[PDB]
Design a protein around this nucleic acid. Sequence first.
DNA 1: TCGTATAAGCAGTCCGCG
DNA 2: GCGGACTGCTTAT
Length: 901
Amino acid sequence: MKEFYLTVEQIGDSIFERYIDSNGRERTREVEYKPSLFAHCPESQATKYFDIYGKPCTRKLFANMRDASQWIKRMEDIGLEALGMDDFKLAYLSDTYNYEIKYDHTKIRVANFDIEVTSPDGFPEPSQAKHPIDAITHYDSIDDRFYVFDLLNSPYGNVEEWSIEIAAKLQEQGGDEVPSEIIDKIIYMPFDNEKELLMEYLNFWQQKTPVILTGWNVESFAIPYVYNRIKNIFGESTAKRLSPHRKTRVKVIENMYGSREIITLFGISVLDYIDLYKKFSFTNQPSYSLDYISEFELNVGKLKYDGPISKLRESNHQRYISYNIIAVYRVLQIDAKRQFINLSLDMGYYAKIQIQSVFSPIKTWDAIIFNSLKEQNKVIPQGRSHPVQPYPGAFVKEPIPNRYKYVMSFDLTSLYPSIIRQVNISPETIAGTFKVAPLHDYINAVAERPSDVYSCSPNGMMYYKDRDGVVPTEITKVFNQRKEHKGYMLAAQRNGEIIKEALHNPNLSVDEPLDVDYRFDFSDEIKEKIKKLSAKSLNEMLFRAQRTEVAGMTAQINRKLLINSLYGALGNVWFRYYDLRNATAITTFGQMALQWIERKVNEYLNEVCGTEGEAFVLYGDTDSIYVSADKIIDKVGESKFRDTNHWVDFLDKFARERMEPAIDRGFREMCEYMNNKQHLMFMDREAIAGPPLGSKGIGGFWTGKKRYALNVWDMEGTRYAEPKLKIMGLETQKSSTPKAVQKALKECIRRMLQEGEESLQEYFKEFEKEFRQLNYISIASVSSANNIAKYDVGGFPGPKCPFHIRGILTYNRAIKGNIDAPQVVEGEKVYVLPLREGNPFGDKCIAWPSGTEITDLIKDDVLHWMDYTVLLEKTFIKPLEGFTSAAKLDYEKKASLFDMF
DNA sequence: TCGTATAAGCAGTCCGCG
DNA sequence: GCGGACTGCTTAT
Ligand SMILES: Nc1ncnc2c1ncn2[C@H]1C[C@H](O)[C@@H](COP(=O)(O)OP(=O)(O)OP(=O)(O)O)O1
Ligand SMILES: [Ca+2]
Ligand SMILES: [Ca+2]
Ligand SMILES: [Ca+2]
Ligand SMILES: [Ca+2]
Ligand SMILES: [Ca+2]
Ligand SMILES: [Ca+2]
Ligand SMILES: [Ca+2]
């Protein structure tokens, strides 16, 4: 096999590299890597190294890395550019792995771990580590085993061994239902004392040293706790055995308001799954507890136990260990689904970076562009200091708030990256500027042509047309990878719909799901077989189709994230290629393109309908337009259509055969006007929306910018078995809105779009009547809680105190003196409830940590004093009134003359 | 919330608005 | 009570 790195570190003048050798063996080497850096040199001198602008460079080879660093400093003191890759370990990887890396994941040791710590006096601070570690479950991907380290004897209780037999049993037999598929994979090691537990853990760690280290909150909790606990018990040198090169750093993470400490373990790549989830999942969650996320991702039941977690070990050690094991498995189950580790390895090896650098697109892109340029003996510029400066972004059209019955939307593919490619926007392709007319003049094609030589953006920038810049070249590669995976995702989605249809008529028979690749559109043969399957097989196939879709989603959406972040990096001061001229060139062209095509689509439709000045485009945001199709439907007449799918097909065909060609012509003209290198403004039909044929549904509505709902029949070539609500921006989509309220509002919107006003009034009346029965958690609002101390004046609300922060202050007073009560963590989320006048809490709201039941001593009081009226008016009625007035509908039946009978 | 970007919505405080 | 000025938070893109 081809060799690949696992981890790389710089330690003084040595590179420490763990890698897989040609035989598949894990090795470690120390290399006295001599880095090269570059300086500009005279034109006369003959060399093979040039900077990105074609200026000649001389290579300076340093006796060691510290010399290179010292040189960079002296170059700053002199006031001269020190060119080249200043992160020497990236240069080492580039030198050592000068080919496309092909990695074998089966050879990479992925460790998933979780620890337990009993604590009476509240949260066990990792930096203190004052309490014993009494359980560690460590899953190893190479052995495929859960190693369980169990403390039998503690100052907080002596306990009996965990029993694998009870662990396996159903909860109905008094067991813990540890999943039967892992029971055989558990290696249980009980211990008489904490020191031997920890010593053995370290010896184990040494034998099976993680390359990738993950888990849930491992970076913020488990790793620092284990490290500091071993430190406190044995000394630093022993704690540093967690690093394979015996080097660690206490790393301070700085944010806006305060800071925390993590431990950097050299020669390990820590990918904390919470952090992976937050970056790559594209969710915003009310809580980030593992139970909550597991429930959301996997539909698994919450881990059940009585009493505080501080008493679970001594009261039920059996359950204590089993839940520790299960918590580790849950992260693996989430990864089997979401596949973020796979993604991180793909991105990391592609860029030739430390795998943990996938969190940073700036680092990812710096390394991709460096390797790309190195290939041509080109030399990257030095990073520079820049002041943070605002710059303009996308255009968003102000919609007329209204119902909109028939809507067809159109969307530009991967817009910002396409702009970069079309215009040829790169640090080294800048050709100069041209005198800019107001944007409106370009949109209406009355402005003078910017250039007859260069490719232009309406911000005034001109770019070379002779060759592609390194940014277009490298963004195109990842764009093309994204395209492949999105193709797989949509095929899986279309395949899902095929299964949902067949599920309407399941066969009464025993059979097995078809062995198929859901990444490809089902053939005719597969379609026939599906029509003959049982519901049990169809459901398993639907589950599998949907897992394939999710896998594709991860792969495609995060490649899209990476390429859109390359645009965003052009507007970040820490990026090597930071240039506000390039960032603005991109955003300004985007603005032009959307308004240009709006004008075009309007002109085209006014023509085919034989009108003038009619607004067919009702809305647009950044890269997408929404076309009112009412007139198109009316031109054939609703009565001519057999069913919903009939007009959906007709619109599909109108969009494909008539509008897209007009849209294409309009963008090709704009490409010529701007003299761009390559036409890449590809705008395709996205959504087809409208009410069910023969219903009183309104189809869709907008309330304002970034706030709308559509009843969608077809999305990007996926014809739904059942219409799908596409709701953007409205309270149903906000994590701050109560769960039960999101669900109720969503159903109000469903009724509006699919059934009409009367149906809506039916549902509202019932919800209003019954809502006081809803679980308090389901009707709690959610908010992040920043700067709690700032607004805390002697335990009371300071000036301008935010409503949710007031809740927390109320809560804090209610749990005063109690170090066992859950504390609200700064920067984390809270549930928030209003409180009726004259409650014992002494204020108008209370807040407690999200994902949790509120502590038992105040629960009854909260439940008794909860202000249901305020709750209803704020989270439900106000948003609903917003929706309905926008749509010219009433949620309550207005009195009429018929009330006389 | 360490980790690419801007546009823009709504809740809530504070206080004006004769 | 509603709006603007502003903070806080959260979406859409
Ligand atoms: N997370 C982000 N970071 C930076 N820029 C973004 C981000 N999301 C969107 N944008 C900008 C760049 C995008 O090209 C543009 C429109 O985005 P969006 O409608 O999500 O899809 P897209 O056109 O980028 O890809 P596609 O439509 O192919 O899925 O807005
Ligand atoms: Ca736990
Ligand atoms: Ca699209
Ligand atoms: Ca798009
Ligand atoms: Ca059938
Ligand atoms: Ca879009
Ligand atoms: Ca097309
Ligand atoms: Ca009480």
